[PDB]
Amino acid sequence: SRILLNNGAKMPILGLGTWKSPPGQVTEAVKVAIDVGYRHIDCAHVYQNENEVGVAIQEKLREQVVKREELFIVSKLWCTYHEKGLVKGACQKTLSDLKLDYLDLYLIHWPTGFKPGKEFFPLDESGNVVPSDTNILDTWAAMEELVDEGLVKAIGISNFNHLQVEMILNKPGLKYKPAVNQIECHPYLTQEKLIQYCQSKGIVVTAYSPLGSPDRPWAKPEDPSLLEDPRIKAIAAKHNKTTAQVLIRFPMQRNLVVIPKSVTPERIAENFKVFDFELSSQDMTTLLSYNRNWRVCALLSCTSHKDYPFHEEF
Ligand SMILES: NC(=O)c1ccc[n+]([C@@H]2O[C@H](COP(=O)([O-])OP(=O)(O)OC[C@H]3O[C@@H](n4cnc5c(N)ncnc54)[C@H](OP(=O)(O)O)[C@@H]3O)[C@@H](O)[C@H]2O)c1
Ligand SMILES: O=C(O)Cc1nn(Cc2nc3cc(C(F)(F)F)ccc3s2)c(=O)c2ccccc12
Numbered sequence: 001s002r003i004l005l006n007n008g009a010k011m012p013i014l015g016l017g018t019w020k021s022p023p024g025q026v027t028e029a030v031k032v033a034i035d036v037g038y039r040h041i042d043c044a045h046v047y048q049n050e051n052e053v054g055v056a057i058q059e060k061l062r063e064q065v066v067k068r069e070e071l072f073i074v075s076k077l078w079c080t081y082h083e084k085g086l087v088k089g090a091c092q093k094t095l096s097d098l099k100l101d102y103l104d105l106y107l108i109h110w111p112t113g114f115k116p117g118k119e120f121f122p123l124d125e126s127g128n129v130v131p132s133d134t135n136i137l138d139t140w141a142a143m144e145e146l147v148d149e150g151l152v153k154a155i156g157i158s159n160f161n162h163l164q165v166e167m168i169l170n171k172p173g174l175k176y177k178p179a180v181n182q183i184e185c186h187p188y189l190t191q192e193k194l195i196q197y198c199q200s201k202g203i204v205v206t207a208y209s210p211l212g213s214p215d216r217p218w219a220k221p222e223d224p225s226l227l228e229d230p231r232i233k234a235i236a237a238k239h240n241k242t243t244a245q246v247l248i249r250f251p252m253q254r255n256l257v258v259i260p261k262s263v264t265p266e267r268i269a270e271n272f273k274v275f276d277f278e279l280s281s282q283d284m285t286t287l288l289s290y291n292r293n294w295r296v297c298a299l300l301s302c303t304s305h306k307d308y309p310f311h312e313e314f
Pocket of ligand 1: 209
């Protein structure tokens with residue numbers, strides 16, 4: 001149920017996502033999750049609910065349902081903090097909100113730096129995001145210092161394409177390799193090329209939006225529905241499991257970590273019940289065949305950033 005990272009630590013292959021979890025409901029969602037067995041929580045400052053996640057974690061530690069060493073807590077450096085001088089402060093705010101004295105993993109959330117300020121998405125008068133003149137290698141060095149200071153046990157990246165991964169790997173004076181690349185991944189966006197690249201470099205891949213993020217605020221009704229894909233439902237039926245459970249088990253069997261989000265206690269529990277069955281090799285290849293290169297997570301206003309990651313093939 002855990003995978004070995006290149007930093008020597010073990011990461012649970014199933015975690016709870018918290019993007020879009022309302023602040024008034026996420027405390028209970030994370031308490032329920034830890035009660036039913038989750039030991040990995042995926043967080044971010046930009047999700048604006050870390051204080052409330054933190055309440056849950058702290059309460060379960062206080063109740064001795066879990067000890068700190070058994071938890072694997074992940075957070076992410078937001079785009080407006082890529083400057084070398086801001087990275088520590090961003091990490092300590094996340095730590096302060098989560099009521100932790102270290103993070104198990106801290107990720108560069110997106111490869112694109114934006115102008116620092118109070119705005120998460122600073123725009124110019126015509127709507128383009130205002131970039132920062134920070135490059136991912138200086139940002140990376142600043143992340144490495146967090147390891148040396150003991151604020152984080154591992155560092156990694158997210159939404160980096162393979163040329164941007166390669167840039168870090170080739171960084172002159174590279175001190176800690178990224179441990180994880182967290183990317184969008186589901187049967188409509190299977191990422192075989194990027195995943196193979198990352199794994200071949202011993203970088204663990206975490207698959208986000210594994211259910212297709214049907215609650216993403218920019219969803220359109222024309223938009224496909226993984227959960228309602230009758231081919232996926234048939235595979236679930238074959239296994240006496242729900243479609244969500246198949247969608248969660250699928251990345252696990254490609255040696256990925258996967259982080260489904262839910263604030264519904266029945267679904268939190270359901271999503272955890274994925275260790276009692278296995279998809280066949282043929283099931284796996286069939287699921288891979290549904291790839292559409294359909295990406296649910298990105299943003300127009302950022303398309304001219306120099307470091308925009310999805311122009312590349314992979
Ligand atoms: N690094 C990045 O840039 C990045 C980007 C996107 C996401 N992520 C991370 O990955 C997580 C997961 O991705 P996501 O939030 O985009 O979406 P997701 O996990 O693919 O989908 C969550 C949606 O599915 C619903 N759902 C959950 N379990 C279900 C089940 N068993 N049956 C039916 N519906 C179910 C949830 O509903 P309820 O909550 O109402 O139950 C919610 O509407 C995020 O929360 C975040 O932690 C990271
Ligand atoms: O980030 C989350 O975890 C989920 C997430 N995704 N997106 C879609 C995005 N698309 C991007 C594209 C770039 C780009 F690199 F391409 F420029 C940079 C940054 C982003 S945010 C959002 O706009 C967002 C807003 C608030 C909280 C979470 C999110």
